[PDB]
Amino acid sequence: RPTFASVHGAGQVTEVHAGDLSLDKFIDAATLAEAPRLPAANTQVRTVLLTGATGFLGRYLALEWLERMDLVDGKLICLVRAKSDTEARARLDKTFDSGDPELLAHYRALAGDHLEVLAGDKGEADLGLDRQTWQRLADTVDLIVDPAALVNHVLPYSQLFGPNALGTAELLRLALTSKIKPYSYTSTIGVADQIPPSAFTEDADIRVISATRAVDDSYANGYSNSKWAGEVLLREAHDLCGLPVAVFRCDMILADTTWAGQLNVPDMFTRMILSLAATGIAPGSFYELAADGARQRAHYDGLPVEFIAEAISTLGAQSQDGFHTYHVMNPYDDGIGLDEFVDWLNESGCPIQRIADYGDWLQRFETALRALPDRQRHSSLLPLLHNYRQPERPVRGSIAPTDRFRAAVQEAKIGPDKDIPHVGAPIIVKYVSDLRLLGLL
């Protein structure tokens, strides 16, 4: 099998190059030679392969695809990690049994005729699948939707290579066999960590603007490198056979209001809301104060999960030809930041008082967190407090450009706003109600 050492280490690896991620290292010559000669899958999608359905964004994508497949009497095939197909199906079923009877009924009804779950692993040859089954997927899948990844901000690229880079290449083997398949991929806006902002855009070829990258100790260095590698491989595949590709660079994915009991508990944002609610204390401002000591206008760049899933699905690779990259970010200079979230929590009846001095708040906050019972404390912000030692510098809008994504969302009239949504009080309040349902508050 291809490995991080084999691909990038041909001393230790201190830098990686886009050029090293050539398809010949991952895919056999016969497949590569044949790919440009193959026919395309039917433009009308009737079979979808979705990875990461047990994930937070992934489960929302599974609902979108189950609904879409229900329209056309089609099939959704989900690749899930488990020791057997039966166990894999049980894991997915559990994902949707969260204390919301309506969600459970909706999933069950759709799943009965439109869902197939296969146990597998992206890092393994043939996705860990039986060869005949892999061939069936190659023959029948009309779209690959691939949000699965190991999302870990502290691990090195050497360890994230298998699930995130090699895993992309394995899916590409499928996309390049029998019939050419559109591929929708989620990346991270964090790939910009090593790219000059003046050069970073949606339209750019990632291989050109990020040809060489460092391997080091900076935050999320490994994770961002791993996601970049998947984008590079997709670019190589597109040059080879023209497969339609949609890359969605995401960041903060928030909970949403339709279904109860659905949160990404370990996520830093979830931990922050639980912590504020449980302790009842917030700082005068989460952000740097102005010269006159006033609270400054700020914006929290995050988007609710249902909107993101709908956008990835509607604007994805099956929707048009070519290679398209989108920045799934909240671009508004709307004044809705962490301080506003605290105010919304209070308006909802969750009493949170402000401690004016940031340092004073931080010490009181750590003490209060330490005093919480184990179940709350374990899911709190305490293990991540080092990230909050200083107040945040406020930003008006997003750090990333969103011109292509916003225009596409507006053109497709996605969601209630027919545009990228703002974050509102219901999103924040949903964290509290869900935390209560889950037993954390």
Side-chain angles (χ1 to χ4, degrees), residues 32-54:
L32 296 174
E34 174 80 358
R37 322 177 183 130
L38 294 177
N42 197 279
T43 46
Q44 291 167 164
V45 173
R46 293 192 60 217
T47 305
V48 180
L49 175 63
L50 174 65
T51 66
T54 48

Side-chain angles (χ1 to χ4, degrees), residues 201-440:
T201 69
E202 293 160 297
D203 288 350
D205 183 331
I206 188 62
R207 301 172 293 182
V208 173
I209 62 165
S210 194
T212 295
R213 299 172 68 92
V215 176
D216 67 33
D217 300 316
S218 50
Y219 183 70
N221 173 268
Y223 168 66
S224 296
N225 276 327
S226 77
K227 300 299 299 194
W228 159 89
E231 294 196 30
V232 168
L233 294 160
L234 285 159
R235 271 289 183 182
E236 292 291 316
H238 183 74
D239 283 352
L240 180 75
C241 67
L243 86 175
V245 178
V247 171
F248 293 93
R249 300 195 176 124
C250 302
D251 197 24
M252 302 297 178
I253 302 180
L254 303 168
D256 212 339
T257 61
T258 304
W259 311 117
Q262 294 292 340
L263 297 178
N264 192 355
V265 172
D267 179 78
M268 186 171 298
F269 192 84
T270 308
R271 289 176 182 277
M272 172 71 77
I273 301 299
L274 173 54
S275 298
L276 290 169
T279 68
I281 49 164
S285 185
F286 275 101
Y287 307 92
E288 289 174 348
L289 303 174
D292 68 356
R295 186 177 287 130
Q296 297 193 96
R297 187 177 177 84
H299 173 72
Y300 180 86
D301 192 342
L303 293 167
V305 67
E306 294 166 41
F307 168 75
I308 298 179
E310 188 179 357
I312 288 170
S313 299
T314 298
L315 305 179
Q318 83 294 343
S319 80
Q320 62 174 326
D321 295 326
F323 194 111
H324 297 94
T325 300
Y326 301 103
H327 291 170
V328 183
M329 306 287 286
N330 182 336
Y332 305 110
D333 171 13
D334 59 13
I336 302 169
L338 296 166
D339 297 335
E340 285 66 47
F341 298 165
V342 167
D343 294 348
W344 285 332
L345 284 171
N346 272 289
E347 290 184 352
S348 79
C350 180
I352 302 169
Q353 64 181 314
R354 280 182 167 107
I355 306 299
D357 180 83
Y358 189 88
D360 185 20
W361 166 72
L362 185 62
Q363 70 91 359
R364 293 173 177 275
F365 192 62
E366 177 169 11
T367 300
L369 287 175
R370 292 177 52 89
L372 292 174
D374 284 2
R375 191 191 287 168
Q376 289 189 316
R377 191 176 73 261
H378 292 173
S379 290
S380 80
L381 208 56
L382 187 52
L384 300 171
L385 232 46
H386 50 93
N387 291 333
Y388 296 83
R389 295 305 179 187
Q390 302 286 327
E392 198 175 318
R393 178 177 171 297
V395 177
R396 312 279 300 246
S398 177
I399 67 291
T402 52
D403 310 75
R404 299 295 195 185
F405 184 59
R406 192 167 180 205
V409 171
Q410 286 169 337
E411 194 286 328
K413 296 178 183 168
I414 299 172
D417 288 24
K418 298 181 178 48
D419 204 343
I420 302 172
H422 297 256
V423 179
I427 301 305
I428 305 307
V429 175
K430 174 60 155 41
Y431 277 83
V432 173
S433 61
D434 275 3
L435 287 164
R436 288 176 169 153
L437 187 60
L438 290 166
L440 291 166

